[PDB]
Amino acid sequence: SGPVPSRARVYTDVNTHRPREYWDYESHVVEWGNQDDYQLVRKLGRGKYSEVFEAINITNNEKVVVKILKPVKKKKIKREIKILENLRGGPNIITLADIVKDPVSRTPALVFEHVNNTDFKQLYQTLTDYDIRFYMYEILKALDYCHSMGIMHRDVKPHNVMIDHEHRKLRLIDWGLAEFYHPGQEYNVRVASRYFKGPELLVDYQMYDYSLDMWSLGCMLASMIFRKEPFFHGHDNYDQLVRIAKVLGTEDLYDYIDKYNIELDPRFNDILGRHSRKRWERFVHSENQHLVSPEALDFLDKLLRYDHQSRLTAREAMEHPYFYTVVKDQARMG
Ligand SMILES: COc1cc(/C=N/n2c(SC)nnc2-c2ccccc2)c(Br)cc1O
Numbered sequence: 001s002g003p004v005p006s007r008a009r010v011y012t013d014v015n016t017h018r019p020r021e022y023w024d025y026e027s028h029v030v031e032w033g034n035q036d037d038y039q040l041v042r043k044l045g046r047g048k049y050s051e052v053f054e055a056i057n058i059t060n061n062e063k064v065v066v067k068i069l070k071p072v073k074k075k076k077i078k079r080e081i082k083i084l085e086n087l088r089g090g091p092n093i094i095t096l097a098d099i100v101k102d103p104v105s106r107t108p109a110l111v112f113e114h115v116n117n118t119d120f121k122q123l124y125q126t127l128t129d130y131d132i133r134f135y136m137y138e139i140l141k142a143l144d145y146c147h148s149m150g151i152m153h154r155d156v157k158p159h160n161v162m163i164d165h166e167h168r169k170l171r172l173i174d175w176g177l178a179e180f181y182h183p184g185q186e187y188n189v190r191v192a193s194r195y196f197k198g199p200e201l202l203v204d205y206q207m208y209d210y211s212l213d214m215w216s217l218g219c220m221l222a223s224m225i226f227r228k229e230p231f232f233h234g235h236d237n238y239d240q241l242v243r244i245a246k247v248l249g250t251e252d253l254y255d256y257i258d259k260y261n262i263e264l265d266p267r268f269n270d271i272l273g274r275h276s277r278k279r280w281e282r283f284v285h286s287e288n289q290h291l292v293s294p295e296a297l298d299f300l301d302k303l304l305r306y307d308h309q310s311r312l313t314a315r316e317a318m319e320h321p322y323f324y325t326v327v328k329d330q331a332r333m334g
């Protein structure tokens with residue numbers, strides 16, 4: 001009475017059909033650049049796994065971003081490097097420019113192209129309906145590409161989407177939680193930011209796939225169009241699913257649990273309670289209505305589904321009428 005298995009609807013066997021060297025990152029041998037090409041300029045941020053700096057390549061005066069890794073097992077480092085190398089050149093995928101050994105920490109430092117990212121407060125006060133559709137389409141191009149390349153991102157969230165708005169430029173960053181998809185594999189559910197975790201994670205269903213990313217993207221869409229970031233604000237992982245259930249309802253949650261024969265802690269049912277499915281229109285107000293259309297709500301509804309198998313793929317999402325004006329704009333002679 002374990003759960004029912006699951007496999008991706010699309011891109012199921014991408015890695016099955018590639019040479020072992022493509023996905024066997026433990027066998028990757030790093031070739032190191034020269035740290036002395038780069039001078040750190042300003043610390044940007046501190047995380048659990050890395051410290052991030054703006055830097056200059058002193059041989060050409062170009063800005064770059066350096067992520068100095070905290071000490072961790074080679075295998076994790078090799079996984080992120082391999083993924084970044086595999087995906088390099090893909091649409092809106094951050095470009096890994098170099099890999100060096102930091103001369104102070106003696107840990108690897110990943111050197112990326114620089115994105116002049118627009119501060120949050122400004123984007124929040126100025127993004128139009130069209131801007132949201134455009135950037136959503138550009139994220140989807142990155143996700144379709146990485147999924148088609150056999151990789152799940154597993155940390156889609158606003159902080160990992162860099163936007164240089166004056167150049168209409170976006171990059172999906174932080175590939176440190178990314179992993180190769182292999183059908184039938186049980187993955188670690190301790191991925192993604194609390195607020196962007198899919199229901200599969202929250203009920204400990206380990207045989208997930210690319211569709212996790214599409215849940216996370218739907219949480220981003222709702223936060224953007226309804227002007228509430230994060231949209232589903234739980235105080236821990238259990239309460240995260242409660243906050244989802246208060247919107248999607250408990251009927252469809254229990255139908256999902258039943259479909260996959262998922263067992264919940266009796267206390268979990270308790271806090272989940274019983275909730276009607278709410279209309280998306282309930283979240284529309286005078287301060288966000290300019291960003292909301294029936295197309296946006298129809299699209300959001302097809303991303304934010306309990307059942308991972310029933311979510312749109314990235315390519316299906318790109319064909320949604322919500323993006324018709326973006327597709328037109330981009331159909332250019334050049
Ligand atoms: C953490 O993984 C990554 C971070 C960044 C940059 N991050 N970042 C920037 S890029 C110009 N600007 N602010 C931050 C930032 C990072 C961590 C905490 C706070 C801010 C890049 Br290019 C690639 C990564 O794989």
Ligand code: NA
Nearest residue numbers: 035036038039
């Ligand atoms: Na240096």
